[PDB]
Amino acid sequence: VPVPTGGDDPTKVAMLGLTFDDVLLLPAASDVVPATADTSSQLTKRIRLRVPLVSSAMDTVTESRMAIAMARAGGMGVLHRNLPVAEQAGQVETVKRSTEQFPLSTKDSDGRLLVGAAVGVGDDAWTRAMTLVDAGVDVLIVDTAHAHNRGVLDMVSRLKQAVGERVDVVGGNVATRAAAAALVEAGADAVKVGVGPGSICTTRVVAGVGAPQITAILEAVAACKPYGVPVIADGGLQYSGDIAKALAAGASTAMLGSLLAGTAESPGELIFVNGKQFKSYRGMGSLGAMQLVPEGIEGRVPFRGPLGTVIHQLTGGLRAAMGYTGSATIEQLQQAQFVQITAAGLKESHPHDITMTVEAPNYYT
Amino acid sequence: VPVPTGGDDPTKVAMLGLTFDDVLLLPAASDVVPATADTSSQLTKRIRLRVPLVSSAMDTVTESRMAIAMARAGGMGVLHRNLPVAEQAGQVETVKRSTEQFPLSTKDSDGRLLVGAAVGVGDDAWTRAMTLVDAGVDVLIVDTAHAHNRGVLDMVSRLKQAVGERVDVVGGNVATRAAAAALVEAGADAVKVGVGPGSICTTRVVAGVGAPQITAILEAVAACKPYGVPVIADGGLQYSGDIAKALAAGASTAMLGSLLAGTAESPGELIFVNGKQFKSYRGMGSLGAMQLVPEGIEGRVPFRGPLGTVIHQLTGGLRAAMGYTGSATIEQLQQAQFVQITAAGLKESHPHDITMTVEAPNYYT
Amino acid sequence: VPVPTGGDDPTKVAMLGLTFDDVLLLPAASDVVPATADTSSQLTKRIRLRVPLVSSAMDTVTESRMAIAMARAGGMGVLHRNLPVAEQAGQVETVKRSTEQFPLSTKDSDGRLLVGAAVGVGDDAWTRAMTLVDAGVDVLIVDTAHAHNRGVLDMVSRLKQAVGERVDVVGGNVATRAAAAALVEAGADAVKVGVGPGSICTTRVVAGVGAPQITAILEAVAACKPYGVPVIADGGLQYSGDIAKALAAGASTAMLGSLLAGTAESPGELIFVNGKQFKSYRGMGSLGAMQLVPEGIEGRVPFRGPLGTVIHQLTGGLRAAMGYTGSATIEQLQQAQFVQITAAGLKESHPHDITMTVEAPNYYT
Amino acid sequence: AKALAAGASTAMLGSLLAGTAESPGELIFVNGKQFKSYRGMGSLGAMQLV
Numbered sequence A, B, C: 001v002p003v004p005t006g007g008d009d010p011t012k013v014a015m016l017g018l019t020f021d022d023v024l025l026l027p028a029a030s031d032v033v034p035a036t037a038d039t040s041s042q043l044t045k046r047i048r049l050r051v052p053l054v055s056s057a058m059d060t061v062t063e064s065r066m067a068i069a070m071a072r073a074g075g076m077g078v079l080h081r082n083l084p085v086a087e088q089a090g091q092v093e094t095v096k097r098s099t100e101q102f103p104l105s106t107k108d109s110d111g112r113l114l115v116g117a118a119v120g121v122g123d124d125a126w127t128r129a130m131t132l133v134d135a136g137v138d139v140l141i142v143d144t145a146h147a148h149n150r151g152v153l154d155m156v157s158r159l160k161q162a163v164g165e166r167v168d169v170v171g172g173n174v175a176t177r178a179a180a181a182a183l184v185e186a187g188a189d190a191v192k193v194g195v196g197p198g199s200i201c202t203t204r205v206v207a208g209v210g211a212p213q214i215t216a217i218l219e220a221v222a223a224c225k226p227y228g229v230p231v232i233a234d235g236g237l238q239y240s241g242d243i244a245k246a247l248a249a250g251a252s253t254a255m256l257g258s259l260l261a262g263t264a265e266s267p268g269e270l271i272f273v274n275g276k277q278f279k280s281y282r283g284m285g286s287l288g289a290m291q292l293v294p295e296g297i298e299g300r301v302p303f304r305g306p307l308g309t310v311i312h313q314l315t316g317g318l319r320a321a322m323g324y325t326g327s328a329t330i331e332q333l334q335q336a337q338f339v340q341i342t343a344a345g346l347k348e349s350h351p352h353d354i355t356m357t358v359e360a361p362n363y364y365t
Numbered sequence D: 001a002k003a004l005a006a007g008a009s010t011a012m013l014g015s016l017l018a019g020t021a022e023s024p025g026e027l028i029f030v031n032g033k034q035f036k037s038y039r040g041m042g043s044l045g046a047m048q049l050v
């Protein structure tokens, strides 16, 4: 009679959550060469990228240099809002103002690099949004930790009613089906997914609130796909296989954090420790970033070098996944099968019982 | 109505995958003494080996010396293809040219040692295949990472059409029932199973594509057994118990990698570090081997000595398993029962809370 | 249509196995003080012990001194058979020949201590059994690794017909319901359960054959309880909680290995290393003991002191469990219920986030 | 050369010749390198007592 996990209510424990490490992609009938796979994906309803990657709107990840590098690499960049409005407008103008070196670069009709800007909620946020629209940004990301709030939905509706025909609107982070449906009703052009899985996040420990990324993406897609609203998986990605898994679950774009923190094109200066090169990386809710219960931490990540090499490694991993699953395009990769694995399967997936003597470019010891 | 793991599609997560560490063999009513067990099994539809083990077609594992030693021990070796065609034909001839020391040695109708050769897919691959068939090879392995490709199936069909009655053709690695069925339709005499579980493989991390080995073997056997096509489990084997589990899942032969890399007959030079002996071991998709998005790593494995001792230890483990399950032959072992175990059972299986003071021959720290 | 774990046969993976670390005992309505709990249980159909613990028939655990100490403490000992027949008969006589100090001591009708002896399978085993019976042993354990063999059943039946009215017969190790039923029908007076879980056993690694101990005990009890044949859980016990769980699963007696190997009454010289004390402990299938594929290891265990202290600690833990479950007797403990835990619950069970400064007498680091 | 210059007519060699192939003793292997045993006539082993 009672639920096997306790109590009398079968809906107290709603579901079982899968993360990236819980699943693998099943090989299928393939006629696709990895080098001929088209990796174009809809970032929003009206924007298409050549490489479905986006830089995180974090103070140690994305600024004008990183935004330019990402737009040239074929993706896009979202500028962080941990700075005054005038400076952010200057960054937007700098990005918009900047031949054959980058065939995959993302540009508008006026031939200038695309860029995105992150805004909060409030009348101050309204002023910032209007200033950034005047500065000519292409997409505004309403950035909130919990986007199922009434205020966030009202802000999204206001922005769409005001500057809808000019810029695109991307909703704050969600983790359920109802939240995604509410964001789509409000009129958001894209839905960003993830609450907890950030590499520097401590929401699941401090507050005990979170959701595994694969299940959250599946639910959000089940809510957004009938209306054609793209999904951006945000946070939790460590390898290119994770990107492939996120895209195969239904997410149209992936937003990268610590994978782009150690690049040269990122803000922040180099740090030397025992002859090794590291760079700082902190969450936007960290104790320093707030300058109060922090919801993030501070740390250092190894230096990685030029952004082009990292983006090419990630794209190569995605192309290999597409070749394995027989996916000509991302839209076909979004219908690939999944297989769940156990902890033993997890340690079988990684290299095992071998003393790695030299690092691979796409896999770090 | 919604799937407990998210979404509305019940087939999005196809199945739960079991690896070697997830299962154990159930003891059964036995009348078999381990010393009198018959370990012979079919490699292809026409070749039967006295010991159901095959060396991997890797440049650090199998060459003429290892192939000759494996053929003498009762198994077989497969020469790799990371070298020019003329040299590979020379290795084939060297093996074929080379009485009571090895009663279990595998020989053809002329009394010459059996040996196999690995080829790719393409026109140069076809030239290599014709050269090797002229050189006198016994089995040709169409060795590809993803064998459900239309080109690989066409290559297998061409090889069977041309030289089908002289040599046998073994298909590339598959991981699903559909791929094994496609290979069987294409005319393959044996199906090789496994995508990901290699000790040096990084496909499941770089691309996020893979499948646990026990489930893959079960599915491929379900596809192949009604048509009498043998199955060769490739990758992931670390102990003799793993070999017994693979053969119990339905596989007719096991292909060994890192277990044969530390032997004397394997190519490579001995390495001394801090009083200990190792040998290099690299995957055929590693950056060192491809000369880029590599799909392998490089490392070192401890030195284990002569091949015959290792083969005897593995065969003793297999005979112990056959005696435990009451299996007179491998075909009777292929119907043994499995019990699924958890991580706590996983640590209980290995020795626990004991300070091992001397290494056993078949269990290494 | 297909099985979720692979293939078309739902009985290929027969069941899910639970070990000691996967379950906990559920508290129930209790009117039992831990001091008034009756810990007596049946060893065989005609022999009742005051303490349901038995020493292992190993050459590093039980000899005359250990057998005498165990019989004095309220349990029993089983003399190993890795020595000539005359020496074993001498050990039996030494135990028999050997007052308020030990009021719980187990004695036969004549007032002499009880002892058990281990015999193999064969004609030499028959001669050894006859010599031991002449020497006056009370219980013969047909000690085999796999007791579902036809020879083991024949030996048990022959011994039961020969000296069944003078001694009791205990069957070798089983792990399935069918094996226990076969042993019971063969006429065994007690059934010993366990294949793999020994702390020095490598069968699950070498042969890949085994069964988790809780599930094996449950199956064997389901086979044996209707006929009133007791069950002895052998191997895998590390704490008094494990003893309580084993008895609650249906086992009537527990056989202890490494928990008694480091005591003062165990054979062997005390070994000093780094200012601390250890004693040798090796499996009967280890290469050192066999003097050929080994299925055991050698090692050292920390010195623990007199046997009486260890037995008192174990009995205190068992009495605490009996008080928690409200079990006046062991037969009432054999009906307590279990709760299945996960890995997180497993690490919650042990002490966590605390630096232990002094070792508790019953909980060891 | 220095010893002969000081006035010595002949030099007697010890460890300079111990490792040669013509010296008695079994060749020993350590870390893949080759070494040979050398001990003094007053060593504890050679005596077989300060």
Ligand SMILES: O=c1[nH]cnc2c1ncn2[C@@H]1O[C@H](COP(=O)(O)O)[C@@H](O)[C@H]1O
Pocket: A056, A057, A058, A197, A198, A199, A200, A201, A202, A203, A234, A235, A236, A237, A255, A256, A257, A258, A259, A282, A283, A284, A285, A286, A295, A296, A297
């Ligand atoms: O301080 C923080 N707390 C919680 N989430 C954060 C914080 N800073 C950034 N995030 C989010 O977590 C993601 C981390 O990305 P990752 O490093 O790729 O996992 C970012 O892209 C943001 O969406």
Ligand SMILES: O=c1[nH]cnc2c1ncn2[C@@H]1O[C@H](COP(=O)(O)O)[C@@H](O)[C@H]1O
Pocket: B056, B057, B058, B197, B198, B199, B200, B201, B202, B203, B234, B235, B236, B237, B255, B256, B257, B258, B259, B282, B283, B284, B285, B286, B295, B296, B297
């Ligand atoms: O670089 C590589 N990537 C992926 N698979 C590989 C690579 N090199 C070899 N393999 C396969 O993986 C297997 C590994 O076997 P193992 O060393 O026994 O785990 C080999 O026998 C090959 O079939």
Ligand SMILES: O=c1[nH]cnc2c1ncn2[C@@H]1O[C@H](COP(=O)(O)O)[C@@H](O)[C@H]1O
Pocket: C056, C057, C058, C197, C198, C199, C200, C201, C202, C203, C234, C235, C236, C237, C255, C256, C257, C258, C259, C282, C283, C284, C285, C286, C295, C296, C297
């Ligand atoms: O070499 C061996 N291999 C396998 N089982 C063994 C061996 N020696 C003893 N055993 C059994 O395994 C048990 C181990 O007890 P434990 O150390 O308390 O787990 C012994 O009591 C025997 O029943």
Ligand SMILES: O=c1[nH]cnc2c1ncn2[C@@H]1O[C@H](COP(=O)(O)O)[C@@H](O)[C@H]1O
Pocket: D012, D013, D014, D015, D016, D039, D040, D041, D042, D043
């Ligand atoms: O045990 C010993 N103690 C002291 N001198 C020794 C001993 N054995 C040999 N010698 C002398 O020391 C010399 C060592 O030569 P060297 O190896 O060139 O230094 C020998 O040639 C002997 O003359």
Ligand SMILES: [K+]
Pocket: A348, A349, A350, A351, A352, B196, B197, B198, B199, B200, B201, B202, B203, B204
């Ligand atoms: K792997």
Ligand SMILES: [K+]
Pocket: B348, B349, B350, B351, B352, C196, C197, C198, C199, C200, C201, C202, C203, C204
């Ligand atoms: K064990």
